[PDB]
Structure 1
């Protein structure tokens, strides 16, 4: 259960979400435009960069704290939910833990001022097999020259801070995969080019784009550097996604919780056969089932949030994300069902919840990849996926 302090934080997040964000969710989905007005208020209320240390102007809060807040934001608007995830977990967490003092201040100043960082890993031919990426960074003096292409970049065209993963070469000699920090300004940098938008089924208020690097010049001071090498550093950087996974799970949970509350209210108001739909036992049991799965999902995510060291344990986070994301797909569809034909109408928000929830078994590591991860832990086995793995 939550501490008094956590309850206060939850209430503050709920108040902003309900009083400001909830009434914007339809228009944000309709226009597919980044809600700058909401982001400013998310910032002003202290909900961006929450886990940044107080030494750089952060609140020094926990993963659990952010998950509590994320769920409240997502209940109002899926876009605001994901904005809250990206401005608190993931790239910013990786920079916070492995970044130089300089890199941390840069990233913190941007996030605390309202930037939602973009992480740039995935490519058209490199998804679940991320290490197959072709984006490369070639050494040139005290700089690295980046060439390549990413896609489905959440925040493409609106994010300023970018964390880019690239295969690193020193004078033609492959060093491994490294991460590079760059800042998209109204002016530069030269060679960081936003590409075409990938219009999506849901969470449409955040642009997802291709992203290209044409001789993008990055100083070595903006490469995340590791003493024991890049190959070990890249795995260390990946551990940041364990936190982002729990946050993403909390967005799916928030969407589902919203749909559930709306469906339950509708069952009590809507009448057929002379009585509220709530009086029909078949629907009552559907409500019960949604409630049970939602509670389990919340427990899985909050439990995962406090596991591990700096980041959630990889297997607890994987278990919770599988569960939350599948829960959200079932709950949003069944809540839509409570509305009947009105649920199929775009003038009601139920079909949007289904569209919004659907990405969470996919993005950031698919439910399938997560199942393999969980199995590798239970079976205490490496589970190589290549033809010659065994």
Structure 2
């Protein structure tokens, strides 16, 4: 239940980069809401991008746990850098690594290792929790697929090059299921791929969340992730790669909470009222005790989930960890802010940002409610349909 000597080294390397470079840019990144290109370049040069890619394509061949360790250190410095580390190591790049062809893996690897944070494109304005109800379609046309539809809250929209787009595949009018399509966005850009309006967010403002439109987007069949056993199971396998994403997302939430925790504790020791430091008040001591307990548990849950499953973490262990970590983060950041008092409410301190940044993680990548349903389906060992006629 402890890190290996190699993992401490990886942790130290991650912490050094985050504290000496990223930490001093967190406040401004939140102010400008601008994608930190400079920081991403340093993140790449330190080998913290595409870590789970095989060594045969330039990757380090690391584990999910390795990334989770790195991700948390980045998040403790900057929530934006935390999420970037996630998307550039887990999720879309994970599904491509596992299910993609040699050509598709090489294209994805070259981009990520060059410093590109991939963008996954699943959610639609009328299809969030019910992702299987997405209206983005891909009609087959010869050896190509014509994509028409819209996505939103696309993390990295406008700055991401690599795109993994999920769409309902139709063959001569007949539905085939949902498949994933790879496309790359550049200055010249692919015809039909349009970056929609930006959705300005409560926190983690350093990464643009945008709408995304597809107007007769022509994708060759060599850029569709294919399966020998049909797309019907294909849509069930791509989201299994998202089980690793959730653990990473949980690590970001944990990182934010841990930072706020450390800052709150440090403040209690130096801030004095009634002739003494705040740390000498029992009620505040127990609050500190409560936070440390939940943080320790959260870190255990995340790390435990990371080493579970086969290629990706177990879907339910990951769901349990994500629920715990995200909800833990919301309480810790809020209570840590309370330690600062009035100054905690001031934007000249980072405490109010911590609450704003942490708030998204009970929502994005599957809400805490949808994850509870998932966990319940495991314990009860039954399907839990949400439709009116699912029984």
The TM-score with structure 2 as length reference comes to 0.99
Deviations 1:197-219 (A, max 9, x none): 00000000000000000011000
1:124 alignment partner, SS class: coil
Deviation at 1:186, TM superposition (A): 0.5
Deviations 1:89-142 (A, max 9, x none): 000000000000000000000000000000000000000000000000111111
Deviations 1:137-171 (A, max 9, x none): 11111110101000000000000000000000111
Counterpart Cα distance in 1 of 2:180 and 2:165: 5
Deviation at 1:59, TM superposition (A): 0.1
Counterpart Cα distance in 1 of 2:140 and 2:286: 62
Counterpart Cα distance in 1 of 2:175 and 2:322: 34
For residues 63-82 of structure 1, what are the structure 2 equivalents within 5 Å?
63-82=64-83
Deviation at 1:363, TM superposition (A): 0.2
Counterpart Cα distance in 2 of 1:188 and 1:203: 27
2:181 alignment partner, SS class: strand
Counterpart Cα distance in 1 of 2:159 and 2:93: 16
Partner of 2:219: 218
Counterpart Cα distance in 1 of 2:140 and 2:275: 75
Deviation at 1:288, TM superposition (A): 0.4
Question: 1:240 aligned to 2:235?
Answer: no
Counterpart Cα distance in 1 of 2:263 and 2:123: 35
Counterpart Cα distance in 2 of 1:185 and 1:218: 15
Counterpart Cα distance in 1 of 2:126 and 2:263: 40
Deviations 1:181-210 (A, max 9, x none): 000011010110000000000000000000
Counterpart Cα distance in 2 of 1:94 and 1:266: 43
Deviation at 1:33, TM superposition (A): 0.3
Partner of 1:109: 110
Deviations 1:57-84 (A, max 9, x none): 0000000000000000000000000000
More moved, 314-323 vs 375-384: 375-384
Aligned-CA RMSD value: 0.4
Aligned residues: 390
Moved over 4 A (4+): none
Deviation at 1:351, TM superposition (A): 0.2
Counterpart Cα distance in 1 of 2:18 and 2:326: 21
Counterpart Cα distance in 2 of 1:188 and 1:155: 15
Deviations 1:28-73 (A, max 9, x none): 0000000001000000000000000000000000000000000000
- Where in structure 2 are there 5+ consecutive unaligned residues? none
Deviations 1:334-385 (A, max 9, x none): 0000000000000100000000000000000000000010011111111111
Deviation at 1:389, TM superposition (A): 1.0
Partner of 2:56: 55
For residues 346-365 of structure 1, what are the structure 2 equivalents within 5 Å?
346-365=347-366
Deviations 1:1-40 (A, max 9, x none): 0000000000000000000000000000000000001000
2:140 alignment partner, SS class: strand
Partner of 1:312: 313
Counterpart Cα distance in 2 of 1:336 and 1:77: 17
The TM-score with structure 1 as length reference comes to 1.00
Counterpart Cα distance in 1 of 2:241 and 2:363: 18
1:27 alignment partner, SS class: helix
1:235 alignment partner, SS class: helix
Partner of 2:368: 367
Deviations 1:228-247 (A, max 9, x none): 00010110111000000000
Deviations 1:241-270 (A, max 9, x none): 000000000000000000000000000110
Counterpart Cα distance in 1 of 2:370 and 2:212: 25
Counterpart Cα distance in 1 of 2:273 and 2:372: 43
Counterpart Cα distance in 2 of 1:241 and 1:139: 26
Partner of 1:170: 171
Partner of 2:187: 186
Deviations 1:292-335 (A, max 9, x none): 00000000000000000000000000000000000000000000
Counterpart Cα distance in 1 of 2:301 and 2:233: 29
1:359 alignment partner, SS class: helix
Counterpart Cα distance in 2 of 1:122 and 1:25: 28
